[PDB]
Design a protein around this ligand. Structure first.
Ligand SMILES: Nc1ncnc2c1ncn2[C@@H]1O[C@H](COP(=O)(O)OP(=O)(O)O)[C@@H](O)[C@H]1O
Ligand SMILES: [Mg+2]
Lengths: 528, 94, 94, 176
């Protein structure tokens, strides 16, 4: 439709107003003393969140020119959430600081393109200094501290996440879901579990739990439906005289085949259980091969040349124990060669590097966890749904931060890392090619103080006095906003992932640097 | 074990070839079922209209070729055996 | 190698015509399958109602013309040998 | 295209790559990268789907004589034909890989002809007068190396003479 065009300052003030409105709303949630934001939902039950990205994504402005500034800053937090899962409030605060400091130099007649080039130069220098300051996250105590800080000073969330990573290791997968109790509980699933139940209640061998336990069973992997008996009989006979139970993992077992297995279960002639093959489509084939590799067997399929009638005991997989519940079975330990299992894990992690969809590596990581790790489930306990959602977001944020901590290391928290990195970068000779680029550097030098200033401002203290005292100190010296005391940030437990800090600064600089270079804005004209 | 009657011949259909001239392995599903097999039991012969029996052109031991349409599989002690009339065997190999 | 029984005759279906009187080359797909072929093996003869054998009108070596709805292909040594009864041969060429 | 890192990167693809992967993971000959590397292989160009074994067996036997690998470029290789390949791959009797024919419609035919010209072979099809049963080694294309990844294969260098390749390039640029 018709477009309204704004130029020069008239365009920039509208853009900055949209930046400030979004960033001020996100500002309120920053730091240990930050407060919650309520966002109304169309379907009722407003969400109470302390996450910057959650608040930013719900902000839209009636003024279309102010909306562009909000929309561009909104995706600073979106990118930070995508790459780090934490620090979205810090990224939004940094982006506003760059815009606020940069607009002063734009109003001073300085070339905004050279300001952007100076901003990029300063951010590159500071990020390099962050790498030097960063220290590896080795101890599980540091993991608890990182999780506690990211869960808004919740030691229970930090401790349960540290326990989860200890149990499942680096290769494990941790998920968060609603709990039934009022307390957080951690459930760890070891081995391979593919969340598929038995096809008949008569497979149960002990009625105490309504589960089907098979000790040292054979596992038959089949990629096609099983309905008749004449094909299952040759392998059933081979299982029969060995005395071991048989677990049949196929697409479906109905009709004569299902009846024969059920009949032999009641009569006690041959103990067995049948489960549906997990997954749909090609994913079903993938995990079926993984089970065969894990169990030291081969998936019987005419697509590979194997036949069910010609299937032998050597082709069948083996395990020490498997238990089949109403809706899931767990293979306690496969009999496959660990060298083949490690090779299979290597192949999947190579595929992980090539995954293109969000659910692609997520399921790929689940397969790796099933093979050479574990799956941990954190059930968040809360009295009401509104508190459950707020707690789950904090647990998810703490999980993302702890993952970022082991990936890239830890730095002192409370905005100290950016200040220490800035001083190291300046001491290393950070300079631009022209006075406009020097001003762009000075924009970033002032901007990196903003996360500490807004943390202190939310705590009710004086940001400028605290920042000056922190800059007087060296190393991990910082200000604890929770207790209002100065001290060693690492000793006091205020830890930040260096990946989160680096991502927040880089995302903020890229967007806010572009915002300084805007001279004209085009939006759809209002409908009179 | 199995004794045919009149013109009936019992044949064990041979396995579909697995290797080739160059050694290429064909999967059992892909391998077409051959129309040949060796004879295990032979009948006395069809009673022609004037009495007596028709001399049989196949004796127990030879390899015979039969049409795919003809024959019936018998379930005794597990092995698959094809029982069919004498006229369906169209040739004898070696 | 192959010995037919009674009225059966083994014929190798000759390949489709390739070059014409004018030398036009026809692709194998377009070329219609001829109903002719030479005989490699011949049966002893059909046993008629009184015994003995019916004299055969086809001798090993000639070219015979047979129906396109008759005969069955045999998978022996990969050749396109066709086995059919003596009555399906419409005629004998030269 | 969009990059994953923060720095610009240049990726150069040499030779013929038609962004089509293998139809079966068992074609992989080295698990280190999950790729199917064929050294001095034959290339079979087919413009029709391959499902049965009785037609592909005559040409699969010929490549077994020399022992060189065989790359089958066709619309689809499934059923008995796909099965026969994987049985031979695992047993080591004959190493081979099969990929889908790149492109849709007439563009698939044009690029298939380009591969045949590049590799020095011919596209086997009943529309020209060639049958898969009567296909010989001379009709097959050749290359010194080809690698089949999960979603793409690269023919490093075709075996066709540069004279025909240049003529084919001239024809396309005229059509441009
Ligand atoms: N007790 C504390 N004292 C000082 N700074 C803290 C304390 N706890 C957390 N912080 C700082 O507050 C920041 C957390 O901000 P938060 O509100 O979680 O939003 P985001 O996760 O988007 O940055 C971290 O950078 C951390 O360094
Ligand atoms: Mg946080």
């Amino acid at each position: 439709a018709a477009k309204e065009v704004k130029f020069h300052d008239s365009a920039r003030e509208r853009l900055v107003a949209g930046v400030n409105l979004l960033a001020n709303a996100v500002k309120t949630t920053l730091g240990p003393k930050g407060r919650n934001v309520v966002i109304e939902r169309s379907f009722g039950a407003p969400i109470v969140t302390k996450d910057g990205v959650t608040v930013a994504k719900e902000i839209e402005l009636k003024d279309k020119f102010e909306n562009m500034g909000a929309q561009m800053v909104k995706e600073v937090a979106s990118k930070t959430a995508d790459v780090a899962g934490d620090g979205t409030t810090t990224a939004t605060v940094l982006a506003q600081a760059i815009v606020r400091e940069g607009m002063k130099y734009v109003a001073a007649g300085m070339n905004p393109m050279d300001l952007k080039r100076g901003i990029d130069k300063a951010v590159t220098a500071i990020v390099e200094e962050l790498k030097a300051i960063s220290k590896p996250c080795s101890t599980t105590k540091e993991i608890a501290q990182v999780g506690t800080i990211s869960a808004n000073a919740d030691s229970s969330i930090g401790e349960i996440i540290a326990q989860a990573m200890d149990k499942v290791g680096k290769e494990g997968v941790i998920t968060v879901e609603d709990g039934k109790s009022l307390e957080n509980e951690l459930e760890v699933v070891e081995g391979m579990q593919f969340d598929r139940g038995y096809l008949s209640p008569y497979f149960i061998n002990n009625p105490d739990k309504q589960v089907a336990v098979l000790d040292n069973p054979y596992i038959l992997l089949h990629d096609k439906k099983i309905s008749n008996i004449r094909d299952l009989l040759p392998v059933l006979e081979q299982v029969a005289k060995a005395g071991r139970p048989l677990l049949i993992i196929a697409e479906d077992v109905e009709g004569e085949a299902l009846a024969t297995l059920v009949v032999n279960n009641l009569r006690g002639i041959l103990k067995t259980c049948a489960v549906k093959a997990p997954g749909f489509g090609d994913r079903r084939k993938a995990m079926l091969q993984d089970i065969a590799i894990l169990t030291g067997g081969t998936v019987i399929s005419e697509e590979v040349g194997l036949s069910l009638e010609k299937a032998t005991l050597e082709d069948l997989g083996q395990a020490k124990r498997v238990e089949v519940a109403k809706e899931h079975t767990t293979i306690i330990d496969g009999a496959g060669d660990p060298a083949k299992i490690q090779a299979r894990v290597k192949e999947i992690r190579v595929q992980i590097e090539e995954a293109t969809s969000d659910y692609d590596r997520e399921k790929l990581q689940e397969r790796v966890a099933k093979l050479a790790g574990g799956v941990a489930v954190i059930k968040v306990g809360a009295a009401t749904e509104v508190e459950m959602k707020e707690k789950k977001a904090r647990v998810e944020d703490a999980l993302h931060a702890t993952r970022a901590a082991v990936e890239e290391g830890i730095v002192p928290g409370g905005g100290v890392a950016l200040l220490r990195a800035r001083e190291a970068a300046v001491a290393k000779g950070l300079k631009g090619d022209n006075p406009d680029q020097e001003a762009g550097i000075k924009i970033v030098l002032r901007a990196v103080e903003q996360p500490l200033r807004e943390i202190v401002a939310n705590a009710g203290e004086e940001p400028s006095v605290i920042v000056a005292k922190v800059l007087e100190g060296k190393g991990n010296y910082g200000y604890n906003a929770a207790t209002g005391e100065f001290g060693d940030m690492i000793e006091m437990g205020v830890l930040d992932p260096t990946k989160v800090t680096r991502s927040a600064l880089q995302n903020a600089a890229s967007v806010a640097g572009l915002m300084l270079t805007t001279e004209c804005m085009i939006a759809e004209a209002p409908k009179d | 074990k199995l004794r045919p009657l009149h013109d009936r011949v019992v044949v064990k259909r041979i396995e579909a070839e697995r290797k080739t001239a160059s050694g290429i392995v064909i999967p059992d599903t892909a391998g077409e079922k051959p129309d040949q097999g060796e004879v295990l039991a032979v009948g006395d012969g069809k009673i022609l209209d004037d009495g007596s029996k028709r001399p049989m052109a196949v004796k127990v031991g030879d390899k015979v070729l039969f049409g795919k349409y003809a024959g019936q599989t018998v379930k005794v002690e597990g092995e698959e055996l094809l029982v069919l009339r004498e006229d369906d065997i169209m040739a004898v190999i070696e």
